[PDB]
Amino acid sequence: EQVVAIASNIGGKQALETVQRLLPVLCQAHGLTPEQVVAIASHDGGKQALE
Helix, strand or coil, X not given: CCHHHHHHHHHCCHHHHXXXXXXXXXXXXXXXXXXXXXXXXXHHCCCCCCC
């Protein structure tokens, strides 16, 4: 279990809840925050019509 999974369990949007949770993490560790690029694209340009 992880915060990125618990929040998404409540919200119902794993790809969206994980990006908001890993946002400060990847922003502090790197800054670029690829999550808003890769994870978002995985849902928008991928798992959209199937979600």
